[PDB]
Enzyme design. Structure first.
Site, short mmCIF file in Angstrom:
data_model
loop_
_atom_site.label_atom_id
_atom_site.label_comp_id
_atom_site.label_asym_id
_atom_site.label_seq_id
_atom_site.Cartn_x
_atom_site.Cartn_y
_atom_site.Cartn_z
N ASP A 18 -28.72 -69.92 -47.10
CA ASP A 18 -27.38 -69.60 -47.52
C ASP A 18 -27.33 -68.25 -48.24
OD1 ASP A 18 -26.72 -72.26 -46.62
OD2 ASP A 18 -27.26 -73.02 -48.61
N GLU A 229 -17.45 -74.81 -43.38
CA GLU A 229 -17.96 -74.39 -44.68
C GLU A 229 -18.34 -72.90 -44.66
OE1 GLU A 229 -22.51 -76.01 -43.70
OE2 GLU A 229 -21.28 -77.05 -45.16
O1 LIG Z 1 -27.30 -75.48 -47.78
C1 LIG Z 1 -26.56 -76.43 -48.53
C2 LIG Z 1 -25.22 -76.53 -47.85
O2 LIG Z 1 -25.41 -76.62 -46.43
C3 LIG Z 1 -24.71 -75.59 -45.76
O3 LIG Z 1 -25.58 -74.51 -45.28
C4 LIG Z 1 -23.67 -75.22 -46.82
O4 LIG Z 1 -23.00 -74.00 -46.57
C5 LIG Z 1 -24.38 -75.31 -48.16
O5 LIG Z 1 -23.56 -75.58 -49.33
O1 LIG Z 2 -22.11 -82.87 -44.52
C1 LIG Z 2 -23.15 -81.94 -44.83
C2 LIG Z 2 -22.50 -80.62 -45.20
O2 LIG Z 2 -21.86 -80.79 -46.46
C3 LIG Z 2 -23.54 -79.50 -45.27
O3 LIG Z 2 -24.42 -79.73 -46.37
C4 LIG Z 2 -24.35 -79.47 -43.98
O4 LIG Z 2 -24.98 -80.73 -43.80
C5 LIG Z 2 -24.06 -81.82 -43.62
O5 LIG Z 2 -24.75 -83.06 -43.46
#
Ligand SMILES: OC[C@@H]1O[C@H](O)[C@H](O)[C@H]1O
Ligand SMILES: O[C@@H]1[C@@H](O)[C@@H](O)CO[C@H]1O
Ligand code: NA
Ligand code: NA
Length: 330
Positions: A18, A229
């Site tokens: 990330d 996201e």
């Molecule tokens: O890496 C942890 C979570 O998974 C996804 O990559 C998201 O964007 C992050 O908050």
């Molecule tokens: O739902 C989750 C999302 O919040 C992100 O963390 C990627 O992985 C998924 O399982």
């Protein structure tokens, strides 16, 4: 040694994910998640991502030596946090540096907190409570040309955005995915102008509208294009670029608009799917070149929760379109 030459992992001594990249003091500072092999159950709520601290990384050039500045913030020192330090971001204002981070509070509800330092490398002192009115995950704090700072945020599924429709948490038995109405407009990412002191929101949180080329809302059933996201904002030619992950379809995509709040018109793909389920990026200009920071699960041999960050050059056309990057072609 110098790194970032041929899409190789930028660091290998720890797992990193990330990447949120910024140019501070003429260096690239990267604020990634620090992945650890917690061995917690893997599921669609993200319990396999059980990160506990943040390391700040920096580069003086790309390619270049990557400096790991140690532990910048540890979950054990965040008074309000219960578990799960997910993707962070940073901002600079008036000689202070602010690390924004999503974490679950003691009731297992994601909030976004801030921590403060005198250096872009940290370490950072966390505020004792999360930001009032924050929720969900994946903050991106964007400094516009006029000096105004905006937080973009949100993530569905495990990021819990779908449980905040009313402005209050709907509870742990509420939707595990989205609105569960595929013919309605998809859930949009969130935006708020930041307070002058960078510790709170200066307005009620807004939701961003994303539309197709015809001007119609991107629908909940359109998983190839709809927001999941990893919101990110950058500007090119005075145009605003909202980019984001689509999650279960594994794309980074982008949409363009004329102001921070949108609406944004879907344009196309930034980054095709990588090794491992997640896809998360940032886009930053450094020495007159644009770079796409991203990650994959290559270093761990494909483990979802043990990732490594990478970088490659990103090309805008003069008309504002961006050339799609496919991660494993050259
Ligand atoms: O890496 C942890 C979570 O998974 C996804 O990559 C998201 O964007 C992050 O908050
Ligand atoms: O739902 C989750 C999302 O919040 C992100 O963390 C990627 O992985 C998924 O399982
Ligand atoms: Na981001
Ligand atoms: Na394209």
């Amino acid at each position: 040694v110098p790194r970032g030459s041929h899409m190789e992992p930028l660091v290998t001594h720890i797992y990193t994910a990330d990447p949120s990249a910024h140019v501070f003091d003429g260096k690239v500072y990267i604020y990634p998640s620090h992945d650890i092999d917690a061995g917690t159950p893997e599921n669609d709520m993200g319990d396999h991502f059980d990160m506990r601290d943040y390391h700040v990384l920096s580069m003086n050039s790309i390619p270049g030596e990557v400096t790991d500045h140690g532990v910048a913030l540890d979950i054990k020192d965040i008074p309000w946090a219960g578990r799960q330090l997910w993707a962070p971001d940073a901002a600079s204002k008036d000689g202070k540096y602010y690390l924004y981070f999503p974490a679950k509070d003691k009731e297992d509800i994601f909030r976004i907190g801030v921590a403060v330092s005198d250096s872009p490398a940290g370490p950072f002192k966390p505020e004792s409570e999360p930001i009032k009115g924050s929720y969900s995950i994946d903050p991106a704090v964007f400094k516009d040309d006029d000096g105004k700072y905006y937080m973009y945020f949100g993530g569905i599924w495990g990021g819990q955005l779908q449980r905040w429709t009313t402005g209050e948490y709907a509870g742990h038995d509420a939707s595990k995915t989205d609105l569960e109405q595929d013919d309605a407009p998809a859930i949009g990412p969130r935006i708020a102008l930041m307070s002058d002191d960078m510790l709170s929101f200066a307005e009620p949180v807004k939701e961003i509208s994303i539309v197709d080329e015809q001007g119609n809302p991107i629908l909940g059933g359109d998983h190839d294009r709809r927001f999941f996201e990893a919101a990110w904002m950058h500007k090119y030619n005075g145009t605003y670029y909202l980019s984001y992950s689509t999650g279960d379809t594994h794309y980074i995509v982008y949409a363009t608009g004329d102001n921070p709040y949108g609406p944004f018109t879907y344009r196309g793909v930034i980054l095709n799917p990588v090794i491992g389920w997640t896809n998360h990026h940032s886009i930053v200009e450094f020495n007159g070149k644009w770079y796409l920071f991203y990650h994959d699960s290559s270093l761990s041999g494909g483990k979802t929760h043990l990732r490594c960050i990478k970088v490659t050059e990103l090309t805008h056309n003069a008309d504002g379109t961006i050339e799609t990057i496919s991660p494993y072609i050259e």
